[PDB]
Design a protein around this ligand. Structure first.
Ligand SMILES: CN(C)C(=O)[C@@H](NC(=O)c1ccccc1-c1ccc(C(F)(F)F)cc1)c1cccc(N2CC(CC(F)(F)F)C2)c1
Lengths: 121, 121
């Protein structure tokens, strides 16, 4: 069964109506979030294994919008249970997405590649 | 700017109105083409570095619809457009794998590989 996907910027990938782009110019977590925001987007938010199952194929390690206030997303929403396996790597309050549905804890100041995500409406 | 992409099946990636799905189960070229056909699709066709620029982000190597039976040709009978793929000899064979960035590996058609299906309209 066919359907349209989006809306999305023409240069971003669309999957199940969410829009994704990969950025290989490395930035710390804050600068990555600011970059996504400048594109009317935010860092990757993981909210559904079913709607975001393409993330199983996303390799390497990329900033996502998950933060620990001493885990929650940039928008202030809570991390849903049964979504991500969180593993320590570098002492820090931020997290890198890795396959499959893993989060590696990382110092927010460490430069990394990142994934921006847009959704209209 | 924001636009809709597709149409595509709900479980496929949409990019610039083309639909892509990756298959992790290793199959030879013939079985991979049959699998794509069962989903009303074909193996990946590469026709434009601009319309398909994010093929540069694909990791590993995967069957595409390029075959030697003349020059190399696609499943649909069309010719390979010049200045699109760097063709590299890897195995004795009449089939080709896609690898980034815009490379085609000549490969034995009987070798099991992962594959990419593509649909348009
Ligand atoms: C950070 N990155 C970039 C990754 O981990 C990378 N992973 C693998 O390529 C990848 C890695 C392992 C196994 C398969 C793949 C893969 C193969 C084909 C496709 C297909 F079917 F899309 F071709 C997608 C993934 C990635 C993840 C998610 C999407 C992409 N995309 C490139 C765009 C291609 C399109 F044609 F749609 F524009 C979408 C790339």
């Amino acid at each position: 069964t066919e359907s349209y996907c989006g809306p999305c910027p023409k240069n971003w990938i669309c999957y199940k109506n969410n829009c994704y782009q990969f950025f290989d110019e490395e930035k710390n977590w804050y600068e990555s979030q600011a970059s996504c925001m400048s594109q009317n987007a935010s860092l990757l938010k993981v909210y559904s294994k079913e709607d975001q199952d393409l993330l199983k194929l996303v390799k390497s390690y990329h900033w996502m919008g998950l933060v620990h206030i001493p885990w929650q997303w940039e928008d202030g929403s809570s991390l849903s249970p049964n979504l991500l396996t969180i593993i320590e790597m570098q002492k820090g309050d931020c997290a890198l997405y890795a396959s499959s549905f893993k989060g590696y804890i990382e110092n927010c100041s460490t430069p990394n590649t990142y994934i921006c995500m847009q959704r209209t409406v």
